[PDB]
Design a protein around this ligand. Structure first.
Ligand code: FDE
Ligand SMILES: Oc1c(Cl)cc(Cl)cc1Cl
Length: 134
């Protein structure tokens, strides 16, 4: 289930981080509105851009840290606070990333606990809102 998933994602974090963030960008083409430098690039061309690999990996690492400290897929309010205080982002964009993550898990042949990820995303979004993210 959820804890084992974090370990599975950690064991190939750079490739899962890139492949899930590409699933997100291709499901929600308008989210490139927020990535001037990714517009007009295929998956292969993004995978050659240093900050593509290094940003996606840092984001998923942080998500894994928040997931690892969560109880029953509920993140720490402290963690939400820290995230909101870390330039312009929304709970809607986070929600979409999680929808992409869960669909990516469901289509894998691996026993990902996709329902726990869906609950975790819904609880992180609510935590961010409660901590003052628009
Ligand atoms: C959808 C989504 C999701 C997400 C998630 C996340 C998590 C968990 C964490 C995070 C963090 C962050 N962000 Fe994050 N995210 C996103 C998005 C984003 C954007 C769009 C930005 C900026 C804008 C531009 O310009 O690109 C960011 C951004 C961000 C940041 C800053 C940048 C760098 O420096 O790297 C940080 C730190 N993000 N993040
Ligand atoms: O370059 C970025 C990527 Cl690939 C993902 C996110 Cl969430 C943020 C940035 Cl700045």
């Amino acid at each position: 289930g959820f804890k084992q998933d974090i370990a599975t994602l950690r064991g190939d974090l750079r490739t899962y981080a890139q492949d899930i963030f590409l699933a997100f960008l291709n499901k929600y083409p308008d989210e490139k509105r927020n990535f001037k430098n990714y517009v007009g690039k295929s998956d292969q061309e993004l995978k050659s851009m240093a900050k593509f690999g290094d940003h996606t990996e840092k984001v998923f690492n942080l998500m894994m840290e928040v997931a690892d400290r969560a109880t029953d897929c509920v993140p720490l309010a402290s963690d939400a606070s820290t995230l909101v205080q870390m330039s312009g982002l929304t709970t809607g964009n986070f929600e979409k990333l999680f929808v992409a993550l869960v669909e990516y898990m469901r289509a894998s042949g691996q026993s990902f606990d996709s329902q726990s990820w869906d609950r975790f995303g819904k609880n992180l979004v609510s935590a961010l809102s409660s901590a003052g993210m628009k």
